[PDB]
Amino acid sequence: SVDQKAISTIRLLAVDAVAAANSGHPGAPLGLAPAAHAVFKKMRFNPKDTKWINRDRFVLSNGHACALLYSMLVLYGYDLTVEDLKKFRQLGSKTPGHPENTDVPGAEVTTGPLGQGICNGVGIALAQAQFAATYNKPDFPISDSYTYVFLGDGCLMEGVSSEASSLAGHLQLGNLIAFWDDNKISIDGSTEVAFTEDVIARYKSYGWHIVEVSDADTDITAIAAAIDEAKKVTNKPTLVRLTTTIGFGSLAQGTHGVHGAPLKADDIKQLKTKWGFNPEESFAVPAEVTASYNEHVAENQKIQQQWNELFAAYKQKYPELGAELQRRLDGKLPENWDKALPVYTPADAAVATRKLSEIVLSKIIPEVPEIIGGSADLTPSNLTKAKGTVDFQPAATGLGDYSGRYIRYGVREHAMGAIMNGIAAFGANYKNYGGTFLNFVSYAAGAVRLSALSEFPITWVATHDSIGLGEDGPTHQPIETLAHFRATPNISVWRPADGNETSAAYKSAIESTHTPHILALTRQNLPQLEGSSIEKASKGGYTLVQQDKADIIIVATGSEVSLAVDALKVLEGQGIKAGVVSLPDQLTFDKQSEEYKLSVLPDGVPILSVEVMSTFGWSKYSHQQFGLNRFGASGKAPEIFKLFEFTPEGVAERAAKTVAFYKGKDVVSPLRSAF
Amino acid sequence: SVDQKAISTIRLLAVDAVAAANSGHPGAPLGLAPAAHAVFKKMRFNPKDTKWINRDRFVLSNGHACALLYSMLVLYGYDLTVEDLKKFRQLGSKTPGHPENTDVPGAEVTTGPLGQGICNGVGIALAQAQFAATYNKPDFPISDSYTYVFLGDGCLMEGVSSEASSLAGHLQLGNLIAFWDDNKISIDGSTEVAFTEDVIARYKSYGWHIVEVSDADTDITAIAAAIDEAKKVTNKPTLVRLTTTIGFGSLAQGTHGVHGAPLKADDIKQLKTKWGFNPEESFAVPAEVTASYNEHVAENQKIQQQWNELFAAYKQKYPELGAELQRRLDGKLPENWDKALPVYTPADAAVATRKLSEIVLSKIIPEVPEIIGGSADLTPSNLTKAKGTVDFQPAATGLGDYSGRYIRYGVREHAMGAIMNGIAAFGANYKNYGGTFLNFVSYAAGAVRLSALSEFPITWVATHDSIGLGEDGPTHQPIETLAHFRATPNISVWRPADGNETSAAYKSAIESTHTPHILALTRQNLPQLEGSSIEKASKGGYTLVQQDKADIIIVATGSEVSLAVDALKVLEGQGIKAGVVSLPDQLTFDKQSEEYKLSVLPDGVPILSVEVMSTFGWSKYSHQQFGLNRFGASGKAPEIFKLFEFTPEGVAERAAKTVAFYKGKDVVSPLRSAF
Ligand SMILES: Cc1ncc(C[n+]2csc(CCOP(=O)(O)OP(=O)(O)O)c2C)c(N)n1
Numbered sequence A, B: 001s002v003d004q005k006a007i008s009t010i011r012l013l014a015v016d017a018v019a020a021a022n023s024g025h026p027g028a029p030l031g032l033a034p035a036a037h038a039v040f041k042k043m044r045f046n047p048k049d050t051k052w053i054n055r056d057r058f059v060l061s062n063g064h065a066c067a068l069l070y071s072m073l074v075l076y077g078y079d080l081t082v083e084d085l086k087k088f089r090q091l092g093s094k095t096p097g098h099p100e101n102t103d104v105p106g107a108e109v110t111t112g113p114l115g116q117g118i119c120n121g122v123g124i125a126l127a128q129a130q131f132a133a134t135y136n137k138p139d140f141p142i143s144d145s146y147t148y149v150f151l152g153d154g155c156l157m158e159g160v161s162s163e164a165s166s167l168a169g170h171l172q173l174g175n176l177i178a179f180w181d182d183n184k185i186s187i188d189g190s191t192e193v194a195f196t197e198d199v200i201a202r203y204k205s206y207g208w209h210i211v212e213v214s215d216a217d218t219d220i221t222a223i224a225a226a227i228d229e230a231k232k233v234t235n236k237p238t239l240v241r242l243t244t245t246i247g248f249g250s251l252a253q254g255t256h257g258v259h260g261a262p263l264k265a266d267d268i269k270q271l272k273t274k275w276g277f278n279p280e281e282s283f284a285v286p287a288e289v290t291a292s293y294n295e296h297v298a299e300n301q302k303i304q305q306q307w308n309e310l311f312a313a314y315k316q317k318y319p320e321l322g323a324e325l326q327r328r329l330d331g332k333l334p335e336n337w338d339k340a341l342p343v344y345t346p347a348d349a350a351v352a353t354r355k356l357s358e359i360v361l362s363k364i365i366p367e368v369p370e371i372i373g374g375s376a377d378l379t380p381s382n383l384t385k386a387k388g389t390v391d392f393q394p395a396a397t398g399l400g401d402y403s404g405r406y407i408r409y410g411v412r413e414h415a416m417g418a419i420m421n422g423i424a425a426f427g428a429n430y431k432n433y434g435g436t437f438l439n440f441v442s443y444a445a446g447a448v449r450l451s452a453l454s455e456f457p458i459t460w461v462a463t464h465d466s467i468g469l470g471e472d473g474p475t476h477q478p479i480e481t482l483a484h485f486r487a488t489p490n491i492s493v494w495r496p497a498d499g500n501e502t503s504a505a506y507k508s509a510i511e512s513t514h515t516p517h518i519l520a521l522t523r524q525n526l527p528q529l530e531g532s533s534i535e536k537a538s539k540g541g542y543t544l545v546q547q548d549k550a551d552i553i554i555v556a557t558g559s560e561v562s563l564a565v566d567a568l569k570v571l572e573g574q575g576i577k578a579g580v581v582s583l584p585d586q587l588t589f590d591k592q593s594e595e596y597k598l599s600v601l602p603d604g605v606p607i608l609s610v611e612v613m614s615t616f617g618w619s620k621y622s623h624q625q626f627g628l629n630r631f632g633a634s635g636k637a638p639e640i641f642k643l644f645e646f647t648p649e650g651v652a653e654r655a656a657k658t659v660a661f662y663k664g665k666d667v668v669s670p671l672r673s674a675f
């Protein structure tokens, strides 16, 4: 049949791509081709409009199987060709060894690190439910799309997928349909060696619906029926168990050797002849397969055409919501939304930056409907919920509604991070955030790094940033955390010192389209600074106190800026004139012009950094660094600062030593380099 | 009864400790006091010998509840007193806000970061099973101890606990007995808002046994019976569901407000009167409670006394095993064990450092019985299993034995990290390791940081360290990873360049008693270096190529040392004389004498670092840094190195620019500082 020929075409494209690269993973593509064929035939999508907001989404969580995804995209006429498949895993190609949303048309997210994609799918589905609840009206199903996820045993072993699956079951996400490649093989061999749990019983315990397909190597009728069954269960996400043979058809099928290395040439020949293909030919695409797939594309394009007319009619029937939806689909924030950002003067009271963050959210959430967010069981500590908003929950629980804007993630930082990536991936200008203590953002590093690689504008509201949190002690007090994320490409790590800087940090985070943000916020109160503004802090680094005859410049962030200002006064009594630079975001600062940066960190003056955590990275901006390179302590925060000499006198002493160390030396800006 | 009085004493000590600090968590201590009383009365332990190898272990995974643990330790006469309780959460005290094994006698591990302790308990139980299988003989139950863990809803939400619980069920760890504080309250309120899964059904799916205690606020008879029942189920770990009221007895019982803040003074008064205590008195310890607890201690001490005689008789009956056991309990490695480390010369073939690591393990595992380890589903990639060894599995599976030495962790990096901490915590000189790709050590950051804080000598075998891995691409290629871990206090991050350096890295990792190790290892082959040795590499940094008239010194690690040596030859043709420093471990180097370090990085010469990942940290050792501060690429590894100019010519160009940049300048060692 043409369906059988399509499945063989998919299998052989994937195997031929791996063969050409002499690298990659043929086993799962061979096992999952029937399911991929069946799922894509149920999906609504436009290969010529990858951003249609009502498309069904597909996520390959077992990203090593990407030769399968690329084969589907090629066969359906996305902006990816057989010539690209021939360049699988080759430098600069559109077919990298794991899928990257920035590079691959039709890759919704970046997968490969196991466990992430299923969590991203939870986030896409969460966003779809929130979006539909916000915009749909009688006779206007603006959003009614599904989220289809393929995942394997490795994803099911990673704890992040347990977190997201527990939460997705709780949230009754009935438009999520996941498919487990139940092939009983991982890299170390049989799953009997390490993975003997009853997966199905576990998913039932989360509140998922289950469909089992016992012969997923051939039974596309049952796979299609499983999708139909899943669509009838509107209040549970569904897991479809696909019992497959890894490497189906290979001489080496059902073995770990077929997971992750190219097949032997003689194996590929027998695959081709068994399936009616020419063993002398590679990258074959039978025209009947193209015709069949083109028919489905044409039908999907007529569906999108009708959706466009529905949207036009929606704009007439619901003028306000229609204009809001149009603006979001254009990627634009509300005009002058930033006029809602709070502004402070030096006469205003001291406030913790976690509380300043609460106040910002309270002002901007009512003005910017595409902001949603939550906390990992730290809502009253992170201060992440605006009063008067309702939680995102299924209405059946009585605890919220899908139109809600605040997500109770539970104690699930890693899944929160990956779900945030999925919400961003949904599109529609979602600007979403997640709160935890800064030290526990580290639990989510796998997802955070993917936010950076995927270029998603997600935001971590990361409170209790330092030893300033006090009594909870060193298990809670960040030391390495900012260095870790600042060393990751494409992460904006804001550590605002006061009210105006906190507003600048949010302006950056919400305006972002390609850069994730981490906002490092204090437990403890900080004064409003003389010299701060949204305008200056928006530059990432700025001269807070200008001293034309400076003997030293002190560069600081967050809670240490006020400390530097106090140290300047101590230094004046010692006959030393200091300037102060505030550096609320190193990435934003780095992106400014060379001339601007040199106006902040000029030649000819020693520069001392002050920040109560690791000194790593700080030599970019300073000659000497006063930081904290040991773990913290359990006690009242002011006593910890005194213990480590983060006091005006301790800073002044090190500043004076820095001035003395450079006597008789020629000093150039830390911004200078040899290459 | 005296038992009722003991429970009230525990509750009130915990509440009074929180009250004195005006900080901390009274709710779970109030709810769990009956269970703590019952469990400690079943446990065998010696407060005067916290290291008795056959003690039962207790782990408080919900570490915020530590006022409960400290109260138990005080009542049982550990080296912790009521005066220490009065200093709960105060700077420098023995009662920090979360338990720290380095500081608190009777704290087996450091908890507080949720999810960790239960995984540590899995590791303690894994170690006990391996230890018993290694040493027990007929009539000689050298090891027969249990592992008791308390955990709460937050631990059950964290994915790391799912990973470890799946694995523990697979491993049939029948001496593990965990207790879930089922109080239906977390920080965000009712668990109905985010945590509605059927926990018991999930634990059954992992292969755990379940006991439910419906009235755990009072029913210590049922808690004791649950322990007895768990001990009869020798092939499954047991979860005991303790249905409790958070804050039991408080006016605010059963509310989130009692989780994490001190009780009101009037609330404490009514608690005391309801339970027969003086509301005017704090830190009361009724002498009858002390007497009852002392009776149990005295019985336990007689049990240990008899164990010591059993051990003496074991040494006569089994002379070889007895001497091995004695050596391990003394904390000593075998005499001259390091003579088994492989040694290489520059005439030997190029080898990837992952393969050199395999060879080391192959030589040292037969010589050092306290080495065990595993991989997170990457055994044939990390090369972590010595040929001829058997896997650690329950014999009932036919797949291994508890005497085995190789652990199949599955795709569970975070739990692997926390399980490793538990194996180390067991003691008996265990030197244990865990393999994954370096980029996915990041999935385990929560546990890795705790290895450092807890001072455990665990080892990560972290292969595929860079863009040198090639085709898997940027989702797999570390950039920030070494900077992150080097910025964490107390982590030895070895990046060996060749065979001799790899042996030095293992010598450090195995000899370690207080510092975790990460060994960053290559996929690709590297040459044996002229000038390397175990002796020199053991210093962490050393002069590989000495040049008395150096125009520049190039400092490098790992795969970039050979690159630096090749660049030296290019530079010679340009009239530039270079020296080369190899810096296989920055932490070990930092610990050398100032004079030694200056002999490696002297004054008076520009120093350029070369390492194909983040430049963060490198200014400690260099004036200019050539690194990779962007994500990688999917392609053949040599082509990626060429793309980023990590070639002999690219290094030479930057070295020449560095020499030119310092012409006319006075250069002092990067090791110098102002303070
Ligand atoms: C977080 C993470 N850890 C480890 C890996 C390395 N890895 C890639 S594929 C794989 C095995 C996955 O097994 P499974 O999902 O069952 O795939 P299949 O064998 O069916 O192809 C592993 C461990 C990874 N990609 N991500």
Ligand SMILES: Cc1ncc(C[n+]2csc(CCOP(=O)(O)OP(=O)(O)O)c2C)c(N)n1
Binding pocket: A376, A377, A378, A411, A440, A443, B027, B028, B062, B064, B112, B113, B114, B115, B152, B153, B154, B155, B158, B181, B183, B185, B186, B187, B246, B259
């Ligand atoms: C990894 C991690 N994330 C977040 C926290 C912050 N935190 C401390 S206690 C707590 C709530 C724990 O709830 P539960 O375990 O049910 O404790 P209980 O309310 O019963 O005292 C949280 C979120 C943490 N300690 N560790």
Ligand SMILES: [Ca+2]
Binding pocket: A152, A153, A154, A181, A183, A184, A185, A186
């Ligand atoms: Ca599999």
Ligand SMILES: [Ca+2]
Binding pocket: B152, B153, B154, B181, B183, B184, B185, B186
């Ligand atoms: Ca709880």
